[PDB]
């Protein structure tokens, strides 16, 4: 509960409905309920999960940036108070995802694709916490992000082809982590570059997801150089 009385397959079905309706908070609640059934997620089901929370957090991060912008320029208490509200809500979502990753998902993920997928998610949600962090725990949040991403990189390099969309998206986001969280534009640039080049050389074995992501890498390289 709130989702404990609903059938696993009914949760997945409603999550797909919620997606069609752009009800991403419902989507995420339904998928969270699915994970809580204790069984491992399929490919499709992990995709649904990540898209649900990615959207929820994406709206919260977009709003946080607007309020932080307004706050810095105003530098009464109202702007800071409301930014704090959004921030705390955003943190609560990231804690929820990280809690789902730590309790069910990473533990039981035996195959390469699933493990890397969940470790990328773990990196991303610590990265989102790092975007707002200014306390003593900032440093520990950054190294949790790096640590998850690094383990995901190591597995993906041993077990997956260079053109795997999960490998490519991992590198894309890890490279963003280097650039704007860890203040290492050079490492961000080398990682994007090398990922894009190894991927070009393996296209001969595929595709839409992968070319989409390779374009995202090309975009960042163009932005950063």
């Amino acid at each position: 509960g709130a989702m404990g009385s609903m059938e696993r397959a009914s949760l997945i079905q409603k999550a797909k409905l919620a997606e069609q309706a752009e009800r991403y908070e419902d989507m995420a609640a339904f998928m969270k309920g699915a994970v809580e059934k204790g069984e491992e997620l399929s490919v499709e089901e992990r995709n649904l999960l990540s898209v649900a929370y990615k959207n929820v957090v994406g709206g919260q991060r977009a709003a946080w940036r607007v309020l932080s912008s307004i706050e810095q320029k105003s530098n009464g208490p109202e702007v800071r108070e409301y930014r704090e509200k959004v921030e705390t809500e955003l943190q609560g979502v990231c804690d929820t995802v990280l809690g789902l990753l730590d309790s069910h998902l990473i533990k039981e993920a035996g195959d390469a694709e699933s493990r890397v997928f969940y470790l990328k998610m773990k990196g991303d949600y610590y990265r989102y916490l790092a975007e707002v962090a200014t306390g003593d725990d900032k440093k520990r949040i950054i190294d949790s992000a790096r640590s998850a991403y690094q383990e995901a990189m190591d597995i993906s390099k041993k077990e997956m082809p260079p053109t795997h969309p999960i490998r490519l998206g991992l590198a894309l986001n890890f490279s963003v982590f280097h650039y704007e969280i860890a203040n290492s534009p050079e490492e961000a640039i080398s990682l994007a570059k090398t990922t894009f080049d190894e991927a070009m050389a393996d296209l001969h074995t595929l595709y839409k997801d992968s070319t989409l992501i390779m374009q995202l890498l090309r975009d960042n390289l163009t932005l950063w150089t």
């Binding site: 998206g169 894309l172 986001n173 963003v176 890498l217 975009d219």
Partner: peptide, 6 residues
């Protein structure tokens, strides 16, 4: 304007 993530 904004770098891509996925």
């Amino acid at each position: 304007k904004r770098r891509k993530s996925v």
